[model samples]
Target: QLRYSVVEESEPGTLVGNVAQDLGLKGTDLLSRRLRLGSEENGRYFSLSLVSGALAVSQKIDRESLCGASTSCLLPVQVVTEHPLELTRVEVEILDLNDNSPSFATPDREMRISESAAPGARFPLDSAQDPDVGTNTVSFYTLSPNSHFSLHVKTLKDGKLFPELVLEQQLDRETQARHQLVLTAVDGGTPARSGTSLISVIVLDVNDNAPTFQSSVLRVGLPENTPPGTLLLRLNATDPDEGTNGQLDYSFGDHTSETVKNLFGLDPSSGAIHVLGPVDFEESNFYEIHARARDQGQPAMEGHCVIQVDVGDAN
Candidate 1:
């Protein structure tokens, strides 16, 4: 049996081999020799040179699409002589080429993770595909380095690789609200070809942080003769958490006296302090007020600050 080979999925009319020359037949002998394919589909893909008995590709052939995961594409044929009625068996092997690169099905991948999610949690990712067979196909995958996440690779029975994102450490939405990552897939070609997909991870918030005051104590000096409805300094607090958990409401703590509470008006939303009644030097030289800030969580957390107001006689 005479054998010939060509690159799979080669361009149409590619030269495969010279069957008559390989069979030790001369150009004069091939004048009366006829070469034919065993199947009509093979005839559509391959033809023989009438004068030189050279076999060539007549059309394109995709080994993967034709063979369904089979790496090899073989075409069987016969060579005959019309005058002598002689027949010979010939086979053609289609070799795979590293023409295709690994690519993801989608351009972008998105996911959400709760801040309460524990480490070692697994999230599945869509696998990439490469049309080339054997070593030319996708061989491995890689993930960019991140403090909170890692990569895990899974292998199927057919030797296909699947990638997964694993949580390497706990997440805190208060510290970081989102993460961006790059996932790359590479093929096993001599000069490897690769593709990358952008991954966006949104971290959901959990009520894990409490509100905090900017200052433990705020001191202000004011004239005892100060008129009512005068604007005082504004108090400020911050919550690291996001959304409603970060929303803060300001109010007077239980430590404030009723007299002080009635004298001072505190704006709950803006935290601006205003004088509600007249101030007298004889009533008290100094007044102490307490302010509290609490977050809008299931179990609200609170922060406290002491406001020391110093009174002076307006002479």
Candidate 2:
């Protein structure tokens, strides 16, 4: 014994589909066209059962039994051109059902910050905007969601629409130079959807730090007399920061003697210190050269260092 059922409502004005419809037997059609026992040569009967179903209908019936019972029974239903006896065409337009959600372009975004930046510094966020309008507009929010930093709509009020950060916390570079953040955007439409974007903040180095000498006491030994234009000594200065901040420059410090200050010439571009006027190694076999290092960063960061000059008569 086999049973069949159906639930979806048929399109307007059609007992069966037309040429426009798929060539297949509908559950409703099969259930409605049942045979009665003793009515045909073969034993058959209509169950008179109404298999009321939902949008998508599914039921089971004996294919062999149907085939043996009737010649047209269980034949693949096919839509045909519109005719009184046969269907001409059938049109079924199903609307788009949401089977997808918002997606991110990349896994994460990265950036670098300077140590001088204030505690509540904000990083710009550029995310893939959802084209869907109305209920599909992407709604943004911080993920994990840090309360200090926030995800906001970039709206141009005055000249430009800069993202506003809702700061709940402050930033300290000494403790952490880099920060990783994640933001999310969601659609408010039915079935509520969402997506995510990642942001990485890298803090840069600032000249806030002063140059520190490698050694409090530097020692150099050389012959007594050396002439002017002679190379005194080269010093090195480096900052904890990377890039130009670590570059060293040679210069005169406050502790330098009047003669040494005027007599010695140091290259700020290079850490080379040389005797500009006259080098009287006899008066001083060893001398201290002060130099500084500045970085290429804006608002210039600098550091100072000292080098011990060793004078010698021979090579």
Candidate 3:
């Protein structure tokens, strides 16, 4: 049985109201009767004033641990006076506070995902937990901004929200291989509290692409009597795979005619193409060279382009 209510964990020395004149029957009776707040169950929490038989909190108390799921918590504290050997029992009510902090079951997810993972693929994610009930429980979730992943939450039958991550777009590791993010959970308690978990995503690579030339076809005009070894243009191509799969090697392709090969030199390492000898319109005014780039990846992938040179009629 309880006489009054106090906020849970209200701290030691908290004034939980008083019981002086109510219990007194007189101020002098306390000293004479040896008025005592008695019993192991009640002595730890409340203090008794020897002069006036008053009441206040002597120790902090927890409502959640004491009552658990019970909505209305009642504590029966016993007190007595010696002179006449009279007995008195004080009844107490323990109230609640939104005290518990939200927590994640696991704080970090070192996710290793393939770049090929398609959009709409969802990964069931664990949600946050707060032991506190009512307004003190977890409210909703928030996700860090990202391009390839989106957050989703579903309501279960029990009213608990289930968390998930749905892929928003296909990933390409060559564009970006790693993604770092955070997921936060907020509670509905007054002056809300929140917790954050890590979402570290690693995109694995796969060679699903062939080398692509920046320009598939190029045209150049050669001046008459151009000097030998004159630099024309450097070809550019790219492969979007990992390690050796993305390494590109350039050379003259099979489509390059023998005359074109004799007149031009293609650098296998750098893709630079240059004139091999002095140029004159008489030999041939027009020439075409096929420049190719192949990646070092197994089952080597290749791309080719044509470089056409028109030599102006020489005087």
Candidate 4:
């Protein structure tokens, strides 16, 4: 058997190294012997120079496909001689190059966080891989900017960079249910290679907000001749919480006097206020109305507003 050697991927067909050269043998003696690959499947990978007995790479070899998940690949071959009927075995190591780009292990990643999750929370992310070693391997990672999130990079003991997702600000599912982001991995090579992965972040909901009225106090003018079922006003309120927590119900506030309640009607579902009875300017020229907006959360939170009505004489 002959000693093994190494050949770089896509290396030009040039003198790799000196294989065998005897003290007394001239160039002619080596030319008489022929050298060729013996492996049936990999015969095209190598060629032998008959005149010099020099071996060289014939066809380009892709180390990734040939070795597949292996750090190195060995190509076995045999060299036969006619004059002396000698047989020789050889092994050639196929060295890899930085031709292949880095890639994410998975196509996409999914993450979930509560809306109330504290800031500075850290989450581990999948790392990218590159077949090449040393400077050709993945060197760093980058994440897209977001108002509520940030990216952190960690250096491993092996001098590799790991990526982490961090929560930089508070989240509100009511404001945004989910967020889509892109994570990129780059290798430290000439013309740098890169890969990207999609990240989906779902924000869980939480009950943290109370119902609010658009106007704390509203005013209206009503004539004593105003009839029942007249549209007096419409109340508008908003809640930041989502789902049932955001749902609101309207009613007269606890301090609302019975006289105001008896004179006006409130629609619990639509928040529409209408005249419930005839208005008499003689009895009262002004009245104060109080309304409450309550949310559907546990122990429900509420907000209050006031409406003032001015009575006028019918012309």
Which candidate tops lDDT?
1
- Residue lDDT tens for model 1, 1-315: 878888887888898988767776676767754454555755777887777577888889777666555777777777666556667777888788787889898879888998889999999988899988898999999999888889899999989998999999999886788899999999999999999998999998888888778899999999877888898889889998877888999999886788998899899999999999888777888999999998898778888899999888756
Displacement of residue 80 (Cα, Å) in model 3 is: 4.9
Which portions of model 3 miss their true places by more than 4 Å? 1-3, 17-38, 63-76, 79-91, 103-110, 129-131, 156-160, 214-237, 247-315
Q: Considering summed lDDT, which 10 consecutive residues are worst modelled in model 4?
A: 16-25
Q: Model 2 reaches what TM-score against the true structure?
A: 0.44
Report every candidate's CA lDDT. 0.84, 0.49, 0.81, 0.80
Q: Say which candidate scores most in TM-score.
A: 1
Worst window of 10 by summed lDDT in candidate 3: 16-25
TM per model?
0.75, 0.44, 0.62, 0.70
By lDDT rank, best first, the candidates go 1, 3, 4, 2
Model 3: per-residue Cα lDDT over 1-315, one tens digit each: 237778888878776655656665486777777777777667688887776456778888887788875667777777787878977778778776788888997889778888779899998877898767666778998999988899999988966778889999998887888998899999897799998899888998876678899888899997987787888989899987888889999988776677777888888888888888777888888887888898897778898888888998777
CA lDDT for candidate 4: 0.80
Residues 1-315, candidate 4: write the lDDT tens digits: 565565456665755434445212357666565444455554577766656656777777777777765655777777666566666667777766788788988879888888889999998999888877667789889899888889999898977688999998888887789999899999988889999999999997788888889998899897789889999999998988878988999999887788888889899989999999888878899999898998998769898988989999755
Residues 1-315 of candidate 2 have per-residue lDDT tens digits of 121222122232222212111323345553444311222321122111223211121222333333331223332222222222343122222222233356667878776655665655556556545444334445444455653465566755532223444444655455677777767666657877877766777766665654455664556654455567776566655556555655544456667678777867778766676677755545556667656555555557655665676766533
Could you tell me the TM-score of candidate 4?
0.70
Cα lDDT of model 2 overall? 0.49
